[PDB]
Amino acid sequence: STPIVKASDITDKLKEDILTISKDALDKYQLERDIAGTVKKQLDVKYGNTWHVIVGKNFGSYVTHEKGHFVYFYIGPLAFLVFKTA
Amino acid sequence: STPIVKASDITDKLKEDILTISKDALDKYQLERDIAGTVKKQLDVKYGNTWHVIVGKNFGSYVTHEKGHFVYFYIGPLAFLVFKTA
Amino acid sequence: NYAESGIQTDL
Amino acid sequence: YAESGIQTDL
Structure with a gap:
């Protein structure tokens, strides 16, 4: 249940918030x-557009992100890809 | 097998090329x-920046895309999410 | 112009 | 912008 960061280009503060918002989301939605x-x-809303999020157990991805705005992590069996563009 | 398009906002020409490129990729790569x-x-390279691609069997996604530059399709068991941003 | 998309894989 | 390729464990 403890989030495991697999890859990132991000500040600790923004990272902690993304992790927090993501754990909260798990309590609230099944899909x-x-x-x-x-x-x-x-x-x-909080940081400005434009964010993109992928949540799943099986996928590969290649994306482009604004510097300092990318994190890829697991919570339990579930992978999260979170990043920002213009 | 034959691609199955499950969501799109894209011209026929661009769609066909994405499908063709994706099928070619599957002849060469498994990961x-x-x-x-x-x-x-x-x-x-072909259509200008910036594109993002997710390929997998299990994921949910929520993204923002340029109008006319979004397609989500299966080839066999693999789902492809392909879209363009600024 | 830009638009939002939400998708869930079949499996 | 910077590029990121990723692959789930499963």
């Missing part, structure tokens, strides 16, 4: 899409 | 990250 949605929407 | 990376990079 991966909806978990991703609430995290994405919250970050857009 | 989801490899498949995603080659599609993403080819689209960046």
Whole structure:
């Protein structure tokens, strides 16, 4: 249940907040899409657009992100890819 | 097998090329990250930045895309999410 | 112009 | 901008 960061380009503060918002999301939604949605929407509001979120157990991805705005982590069996573009 | 498009906001021409590139990727690569990376990079080159690609069997996603530049499709058991941002 | 998309894989 | 490729463990 303790989040495990697998890769990142991010400040500790923003990272902690993303992890916090993500754990909270898990208490509230059963579908991966909806978990991703609430995290994405919250970050857009709190930090400005444009965020993108993928939540799942099986995927590969190649994306482009604004410097300092990328984190990839697990909570339990669930992987989270969270990043920002313009 | 034959790609199955499950969501789209994209022109036929661009769609067909994404599908073709994705099918070609599957003849060469099995790892989801490899498949995603080659599609993403080819689209960046051919259609301009910035593209993002997710390939997998289990994920939920919530993203923002330029209008006319979004397609989500399966080829066999693999789901492809392909989209462009600023 | 830009738009939001939410998707959930079949499995 | 910077690029990131990732792959889930499972």
